[PDB]
Amino acid sequence: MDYKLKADEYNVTKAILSSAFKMWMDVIEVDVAIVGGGPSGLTAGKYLAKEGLKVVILERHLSFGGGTWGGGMGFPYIVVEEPADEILRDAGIKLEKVEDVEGYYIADSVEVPAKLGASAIDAGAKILTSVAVEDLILREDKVAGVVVQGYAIEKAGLHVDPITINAKYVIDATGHDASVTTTLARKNKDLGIEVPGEKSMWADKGENSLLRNTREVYPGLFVCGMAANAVHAGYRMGAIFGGMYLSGKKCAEMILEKLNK
Amino acid sequence: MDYKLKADEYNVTKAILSSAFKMWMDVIEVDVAIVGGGPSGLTAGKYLAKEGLKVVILERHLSFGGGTWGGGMGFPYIVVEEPADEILRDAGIKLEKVEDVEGYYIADSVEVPAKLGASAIDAGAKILTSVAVEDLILREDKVAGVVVQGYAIEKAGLHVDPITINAKYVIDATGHDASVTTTLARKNKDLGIEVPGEKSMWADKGENSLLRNTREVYPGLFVCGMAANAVHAGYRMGAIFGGMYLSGKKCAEMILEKLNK
Amino acid sequence: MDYKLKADEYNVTKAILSSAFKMWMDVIEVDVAIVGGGPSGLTAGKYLAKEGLKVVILERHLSFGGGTWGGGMGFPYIVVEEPADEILRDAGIKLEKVEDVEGYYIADSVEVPAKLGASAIDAGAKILTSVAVEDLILREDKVAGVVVQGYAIEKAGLHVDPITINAKYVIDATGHDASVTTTLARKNKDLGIEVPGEKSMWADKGENSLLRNTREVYPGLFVCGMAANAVHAGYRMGAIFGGMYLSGKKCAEMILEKLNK
Amino acid sequence: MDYKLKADEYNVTKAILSSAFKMWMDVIEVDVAIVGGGPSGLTAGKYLAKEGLKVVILERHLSFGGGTWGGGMGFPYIVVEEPADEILRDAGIKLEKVEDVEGYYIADSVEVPAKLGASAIDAGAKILTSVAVEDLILREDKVAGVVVQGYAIEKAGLHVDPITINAKYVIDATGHDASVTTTLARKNKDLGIEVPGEKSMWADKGENSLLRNTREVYPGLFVCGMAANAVHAGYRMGAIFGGMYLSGKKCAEMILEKLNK
Amino acid sequence: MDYKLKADEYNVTKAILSSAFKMWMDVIEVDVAIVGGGPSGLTAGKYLAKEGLKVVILERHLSFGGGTWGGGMGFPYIVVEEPADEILRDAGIKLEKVEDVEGYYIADSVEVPAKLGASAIDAGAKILTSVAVEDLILREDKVAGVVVQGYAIEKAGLHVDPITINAKYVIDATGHDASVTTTLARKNKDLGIEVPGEKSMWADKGENSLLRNTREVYPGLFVCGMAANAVHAGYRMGAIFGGMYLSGKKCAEMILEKLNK
Amino acid sequence: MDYKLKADEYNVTKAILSSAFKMWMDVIEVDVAIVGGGPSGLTAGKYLAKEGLKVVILERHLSFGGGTWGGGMGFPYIVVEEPADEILRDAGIKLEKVEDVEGYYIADSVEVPAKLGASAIDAGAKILTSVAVEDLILREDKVAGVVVQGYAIEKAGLHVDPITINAKYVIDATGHDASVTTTLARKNKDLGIEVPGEKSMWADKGENSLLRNTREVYPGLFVCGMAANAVHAGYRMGAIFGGMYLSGKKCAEMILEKLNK
Ligand SMILES: Nc1ncnc2c1ncn2[C@@H]1O[C@H](COP(=O)(O)OP(=O)(O)OC[C@@H](O)[C@@H](O)C(=O)CO)[C@@H](O)[C@H]1O
Ligand SMILES: Nc1ncnc2c1ncn2[C@@H]1O[C@H](COP(=O)(O)OP(=O)(O)OC[C@@H](O)[C@@H](O)C(=O)CO)[C@@H](O)[C@H]1O
Ligand SMILES: Nc1ncnc2c1ncn2[C@@H]1O[C@H](COP(=O)(O)OP(=O)(O)OC[C@@H](O)[C@@H](O)C(=O)CO)[C@@H](O)[C@H]1O
Ligand SMILES: Nc1ncnc2c1ncn2[C@@H]1O[C@H](COP(=O)(O)OP(=O)(O)OC[C@@H](O)[C@@H](O)C(=O)CO)[C@@H](O)[C@H]1O
Ligand SMILES: Nc1ncnc2c1ncn2[C@@H]1O[C@H](COP(=O)(O)OP(=O)(O)OC[C@@H](O)[C@@H](O)C(=O)CO)[C@@H](O)[C@H]1O
Ligand SMILES: Nc1ncnc2c1ncn2[C@@H]1O[C@H](COP(=O)(O)OP(=O)(O)OC[C@@H](O)[C@@H](O)C(=O)CO)[C@@H](O)[C@H]1O
Ligand code: NA
Ligand code: NA
Ligand code: NA
Ligand SMILES: [Tb+3]
Ligand SMILES: [Tb+3]
Ligand SMILES: [Tb+3]
Ligand SMILES: [Tb+3]
Ligand SMILES: [Tb+3]
Ligand SMILES: [Tb+3]
Ligand SMILES: [Tb+3]
Ligand SMILES: [Tb+3]
Ligand SMILES: [Tb+3]
Ligand SMILES: [Tb+3]
Ligand SMILES: [Tb+3]
Ligand SMILES: [Tb+3]
Ligand SMILES: [Tb+3]
Ligand SMILES: [Tb+3]
Ligand SMILES: [Tb+3]
Ligand SMILES: [Tb+3]
Ligand SMILES: [Tb+3]
Ligand SMILES: [Tb+3]
Ligand SMILES: [Tb+3]
Ligand SMILES: [Tb+3]
Ligand SMILES: [Tb+3]
Ligand SMILES: [Tb+3]
Ligand SMILES: [Tb+3]
Ligand SMILES: [Tb+3]
Ligand SMILES: [Tb+3]
Ligand SMILES: [Tb+3]
Ligand SMILES: [Tb+3]
Ligand SMILES: [Tb+3]
Ligand SMILES: [Tb+3]
Ligand SMILES: [Tb+3]
Ligand SMILES: [Tb+3]
Ligand SMILES: [Tb+3]
Ligand SMILES: [Tb+3]
Ligand SMILES: [Tb+3]
Ligand SMILES: [Tb+3]
Ligand SMILES: [Tb+3]
Ligand SMILES: [Tb+3]
Ligand SMILES: [Tb+3]
Ligand SMILES: [Tb+3]
Ligand SMILES: [Tb+3]
Ligand SMILES: [Tb+3]
Ligand SMILES: [Tb+3]
Ligand SMILES: [Tb+3]
Ligand SMILES: [Tb+3]
Ligand SMILES: [Tb+3]
Ligand SMILES: [Tb+3]
Ligand SMILES: [Tb+3]
Ligand SMILES: [Tb+3]
Ligand SMILES: [Tb+3]
Ligand SMILES: [Tb+3]
Ligand SMILES: [Tb+3]
Ligand SMILES: [Tb+3]
Ligand SMILES: [Tb+3]
Ligand SMILES: [Tb+3]
Ligand SMILES: [Tb+3]
Ligand SMILES: [Tb+3]
Ligand SMILES: [Tb+3]
Ligand SMILES: [Tb+3]
Ligand SMILES: [Tb+3]
Ligand SMILES: [Tb+3]
């Protein structure tokens, strides 16, 4: 059975433009602006939106997921350890027990980002891709939002002004580059912020410092995921993501306590 | 609650390599190999796997979704017309009615790919990203599989041999480039296959020729989505995706009839 | 034992220049000039030099080996089927029997090129790397040598004249690109030579046409390895190399009969 | 005589994947991980494997050999001085006496890497090419392994997690870049390691400091070859390789004494 | 002797602009416009200017000389056979007799372009570098000049209009690319001009067809040097330049007869 | 009259290789090695060779001349002031008086490099193009030569060892980059050499400091031309070259006094 389909150019374009502009008018003021659509950023966004907060996750690339897609050296699987596996189970991700290691679970590296993103959207978080955060909005002794630019404009090297998103809290979940905190420190030397970068690999120590390092680095700016270890010179952990998920959830919980919600 | 996490380097690497190995040993022989992880490819894979077939969706880029992510000219929304809207609802995608056009629905362009991919995986389809199909496996008067290469190896220009995936049917769901059918035609001139490419834009005619053009172009090779209009010189339709979803579902139904008769 | 080493700059440079000079004066006239330092080219060179012929193997890249190094899709192993396995054993390559397929042997993809090249050198063949063959030397109704250029000069796009190597026979062992035969055909339209290129993958038919296709395409110019299937529109076979080795050995045997009759 | 060859796609792919995964499962834990497949790295690997140690040589490029291939300024010959010429003789490399200088020997720059690599493989060392070491595994006051990434993934700029290789000792044989020691020093400022880089050319002094500079720079991390002079600000020696070979052999001997084997 | 030098910015800039302006006003109408500052172009320009004609040599690159500089494969020497050696001696170039080949002379590949250019300038020819000829000026059944563009503008890809140079005769001395004749043929299909390109290498036949091929291909457009063999499908000859010099001199003699009859 | 020309491939290649190797054997030991084939380097080479010294000028690009070719902002003329105009007159360069300024002369920017290079060659200096000086040869408290690499090898990024040229004195005439002195200072921090770079433009002061700044910066290493002002933080002078020529001649005179010749 082949259906006669209703299609045109004018109403499709008009519908897309109307929805996109209504969307933009609503996103320019949020409770939390999460920079980076990776495992920790998608987790923080889900747990904040889950509680009724107005949240936007900003991802530079056209698609979200960060460094999960490729797994380990291209082998498409990632490891999660207890109790962080419960966060992936909550997103409907299929997990298998690693035989020689109690507490280790393995998941398809392509299934994880897709389901974590879908779960954040279902919790009420807005995910905007192809949007690069190039700077922050400042106020006296605090961060008050982010400065966004189109990824294509940035990549094409065009000299164009950005637009802004006002937020009560900003989360730097940009990975080992800690690009948001690094930009804040580089452009505002008077603040005395230093981003030493991650140390070499030591999974045991790297995973067990992420939660301690997930905190407010400057008023209004939180750091989570690998960016937390990059800002506090913590070790790397490899293709094990338990700490990334727990770091994102802790970040949400810390901001919820500050907003009393 | 303080979390003492179990983490190391050796067992994480071993677990990833073992799972990836077991996966590769299973995926080298499938019932259907779908080339392209776009809207039509993800739909065809879901409806084929839903019926118990062994299916693999091969996507060149690190993430799937194809041309959905960006919406229309960067505006992050896409249109779907009835009855294709039901396919998106089956994947749990949130749809809004377009004001003034009965039959039109609009969806967040970032939510669609994430949920379509998650739905295909839940139906039992395997999605492999970062894998480029560079050629086909031939037999007397038929296609019998695909020749795959790592996307990074291809992009880096390294001279490396590929590996193969045997399949009863191959689906070219690579979009307007119809790369699979074009490669078959270019390397095997004796077959007399021609890929004229898509015509200019005419949404009404473009959308209503996709189902008619979704067919077996060469024994063992089916074409669906925008690749069907590229192979049969059909018009383009823009950011309206109803035909892409229905074309993928029709493709699955056509292959299911062949394999169950 | 403490080592007091004799070292300077002048005598090291002088020794290198003298040896390179003496080498170039000898290599400008050879019996056979093999273009391509891949599996078939290295085999043809070994079996020709083994019989006392003056042979030179010209490779574009800094190192030889061609497409063997990477194995299959980066997995560092390659397959060889009997009786071609004997050619690899003659070079001292370690082979393992494939479980479940009688006649199949597997070898480390890094060990093969190193040992095939060392075996060709020990047989008396000269291997020159970083040398690109950009054209052929012609005579009435025959090829009489090759036109060589430095790979760095070619890559840098510098406008520099090449030098030449006179040869009784030239072997195009450049792989699927069949660059030597393609250049001959493109620059000399009057000869009526056509290079259709390889067909799609079909290992069974592809491997069993290589020997038939290993022949003299134009007087003085032989084709072997994957270039033979590219010139005669044969199928591809993937990471199985038995035919490549046997094609190189057959090429050497065919030229030896011509030069000893 | 043309043989009917047994060939297919499925069993070739399956055999390659099985061998590659059995290989990867074995390489993730070694006695020594040598970074760099150049003259000193290939020598150190040969002399360690020769004594029964489990060794892996990791090379970034598709082929090993480092800076030997090109000889001096493209002239394809390299010089070796006594007693280092015995190391090349042990690999079966053909040497000629330099006439004006007693103690100097010259060799074909293409024959050296091929035979040094074949000799290391025959001694029992595993050589993995197309593998970039991007970081180290650390423990309290020591290096405990390497962090590896696919060269194509690294070159393609893909954001993908690496995998690891546990080792009792790591050898930085990456040449004048001393990339392993430089990464350790750059990412772990708390260790106080400095990599000044090589000084200008002075063959006499450069060659006679290599052995003194071949040592353990940090517990578990040895440096050899030009990397030894780069880490200790030693002079360059040019296309004379005696010190590179003796440095690699000394490195092996020093590690064998520490492992008591 | 201490030197007190007179220097400023204003008068230096003013002097350069005034001279360049006066120069451009004079060069926009010439008797002959030679395209290409290579061996044949520099020779044709010298012999035309020597007879009192107003001549301009237009070279795309910042410096003239073409493919002489690099000699053969980077070896900085070029061969000239009698009687063309006399043309180089007339320019003051030092020549050495080739041992064992009577009639062959060898010259420093860096000395040749410098002296040929200086000789053309001393004969009265104007050489303009960094000027690309992108098209021709046409009239009924004839070429009447050239369309010039700045090489930097062309290289930078800027969309800028060119300027023109009116000439009684134009010489295509652009080498094997025969860019001027190829542009004329490509943009004016109605003229029926074909540029097959050079054939493979055959020095004996290639050198002995250059003079025969040095002729008027279209009224007002002459072809000389390697461009003459490219337009008439002649063979290549390598690093022997006798024919290039004699072809340039013949071209000048042919144009002089036309302009004095 | 068209002559029957003697031409072949073998003897042309043999003649070029023989001359190039005889040349290389002679150039590896010189009295002075001049780095940079610009106005000051070509002048210094001419005046040193004029006195019977064995001199080699090494230029990175395929052609010499440096920044003279383009004149001022592409306007093809350069200014020379008294008494430096006599140096250009000695090379046979045609000069015109600048009308408003007594002491200023203007010359064709294309005629200058060609004639300065031809004059240096006629004085007995050897000019090698396409040769990059990447480092220096050191001895106790002195520079003893240069480390050379092929420009194409350097540009192509190939990992290849260089060769050397022993010299009593080295001249850094590389322009405002002062690449030779900068490399010496960067690689040998123990020497305490600093290269601040040129200051902004001030022709009067820039031209009148060049001679004072033309001196021996480190034993065996002289600096001349703009490199002299770059090493001593002198001002720029623009398209006026009087100081460049006088600086090169002074450099020659200073070295002749040290060599007592
Ligand atoms: N300035 C920016 N604006 C917007 N997005 C940005 C910006 N900078 C980075 N991003 C984007 O943020 C995302 C961060 O995802 P990413 O996956 O890098 O960070 P993560 O959530 O902490 O997880 C890190 C692990 O993948 C890995 O490091 C590991 O060791 C395993 O545990 C990536 O997808 C970037 O494209
Ligand atoms: N050789 C290949 N191997 C693997 N993947 C491939 C190959 N060639 C293409 N792909 C991948 O296939 C996917 C194709 O997805 P794509 O979204 O382009 O195709 P589609 O499912 O038919 O939908 C088309 C619409 O987006 C759009 O065209 C439209 O409606 C306007 O008229 C993209 O994600 C490619 O990266
Ligand atoms: N013009 C040239 N001059 C010099 N070298 C050249 C030129 N063109 C190519 N080469 C060099 O020639 C070598 C060819 O080696 P290559 O390995 O590609 O050819 P082969 O010996 O027939 O073996 C082919 C298989 O690897 C593979 O195709 C297969 O089995 C799948 O069907 C490569 O190393 C090139 O760099
Ligand atoms: N991070 C990395 N991971 C893996 N491989 C690497 C990495 N960094 C470098 N390599 C690879 O390591 C290899 C080092 O080989 P290389 O030849 O550079 O080092 P070497 O053994 O000390 O010998 C140095 C001489 O060639 C030369 O400098 C000289 O003066 C003559 O004596 C090269 O082939 C690199 O590609
Ligand atoms: N459209 C253009 N406008 C201006 N200059 C141009 C244009 N196209 C080419 N040129 C310039 O013209 C010059 C041509 O010099 P070229 O040296 O290439 O031509 P030639 O004078 O005939 O001598 C050819 C030999 O070098 C060589 O081919 C040989 O003997 C082997 O068979 C080169 O310097 C180009 O940059
Ligand atoms: N490492 C190197 N090896 C070889 N050649 C080199 C190297 N570095 C630079 N060169 C080459 O050296 C040449 C230097 O020529 P350059 O013209 O730059 O130096 P110069 O003789 O002092 O004259 C400077 C003026 O052109 C200009 O600055 C000015 O203000 C007017 O007076 C240039 O042609 C480079 O390509
Ligand atoms: Na298969
Ligand atoms: Na004009
Ligand atoms: Na020759
Ligand atoms: Tb119908
Ligand atoms: Tb508000
Ligand atoms: Tb709600
Ligand atoms: Tb527990
Ligand atoms: Tb345990
Ligand atoms: Tb328990
Ligand atoms: Tb507040
Ligand atoms: Tb980064
Ligand atoms: Tb940094
Ligand atoms: Tb602790
Ligand atoms: Tb609390
Ligand atoms: Tb089966
Ligand atoms: Tb459903
Ligand atoms: Tb309507
Ligand atoms: Tb309605
Ligand atoms: Tb379930
Ligand atoms: Tb069937
Ligand atoms: Tb495309
Ligand atoms: Tb119709
Ligand atoms: Tb039906
Ligand atoms: Tb002969
Ligand atoms: Tb044998
Ligand atoms: Tb069977
Ligand atoms: Tb058996
Ligand atoms: Tb022997
Ligand atoms: Tb014959
Ligand atoms: Tb190719
Ligand atoms: Tb048949
Ligand atoms: Tb026979
Ligand atoms: Tb037969
Ligand atoms: Tb163990
Ligand atoms: Tb053993
Ligand atoms: Tb001794
Ligand atoms: Tb001595
Ligand atoms: Tb002795
Ligand atoms: Tb211990
Ligand atoms: Tb480097
Ligand atoms: Tb550095
Ligand atoms: Tb000492
Ligand atoms: Tb001891
Ligand atoms: Tb007029
Ligand atoms: Tb004369
Ligand atoms: Tb003769
Ligand atoms: Tb004679
Ligand atoms: Tb005069
Ligand atoms: Tb007329
Ligand atoms: Tb060209
Ligand atoms: Tb004839
Ligand atoms: Tb006549
Ligand atoms: Tb005649
Ligand atoms: Tb001496
Ligand atoms: Tb003299
Ligand atoms: Tb005066
Ligand atoms: Tb004044
Ligand atoms: Tb006066
Ligand atoms: Tb002295
Ligand atoms: Tb510079
Ligand atoms: Tb600087
Ligand atoms: Tb003063
Ligand atoms: Tb004095």
Residue numbers in the entry:
A (entry chain A), B (entry chain E), C (entry chain E), D (entry chain A), E (entry chain E), F (entry chain A): 1 to 261
Anything the authors wrote about it?
In this context, we recently proposed a lanthanide-based molecule, named the crystallophore (Tb-Xo4). Tb-Xo4 is a cationic complex with nucleating and phasing properties. In particular, we show that Tb-Xo4 may provide different crystal forms of a single protein and correct the often-encountered defects in crystalline order that may result in low-resolution data as well as twinning. We prove that, beyond these crystallization properties, Tb-Xo4 is one of the most efficient phasing tools compatible with serial crystallography approaches.
Thia­zole synthase (ThiS) is an enzyme involved in the synthesis of thi­amine diphosphate, a cofactor essential in all life forms for amino acid and carbohydrate metabolism. ThiS consists of a homo-octamer for Methano­coccus jannaschii, and was isolated in fraction C [Fig. 3(a)], where it represents about 40% of the total protein content. Four crystallization conditions corresponding to three different space groups were identified in the absence and presence of Tb-Xo4. Crystal form 1 was obtained in two crystallization conditions. Contrary to FprA which was directly phased from the 10 mM Tb-Xo4 added during crystallization, the co-crystallization of ThiS in the presence of 10 mM Tb-Xo4 was not sufficient to derive useful phases for SAD phasing from crystal form 1. We thus applied a 9 min soaking of one native crystal into a cryo-preserving solution containing 100 mM Tb-Xo4. The model is composed of six protein chains, and 49 Tb sites were modelled with refined occupancies ranging from 0.1 to 0.58. The crystallophore can also be used to directly derive native crystals, as shown for ThiS as well as for the structure determination of vitamin B12 transporter BtuM and the structure of propionyl-CoA synthase from Erythrobacter sp. NAP1.
